[PDB]
Amino acid sequence: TDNTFVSGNCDVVIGIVNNTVYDPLQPELDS
């Protein structure tokens, strides 16, 4: 999440693809 920013939506962006984005907060808070 620190290497990218959220904007728009996946239904308008051209050439968008599907994958996973690592969130460092989840492993740290759940541990």
Place this chain on the structure above:
Amino acid sequence: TDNTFVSGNCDVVIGIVNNTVYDPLQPELDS
């Protein structure tokens, strides 16, 4: 916070205004 940075205080900056700054960790911490 990700879109801004902390420096100085509110008594030095001229023309500063008061508003709430969103914290991305707030929803995660409460979860």
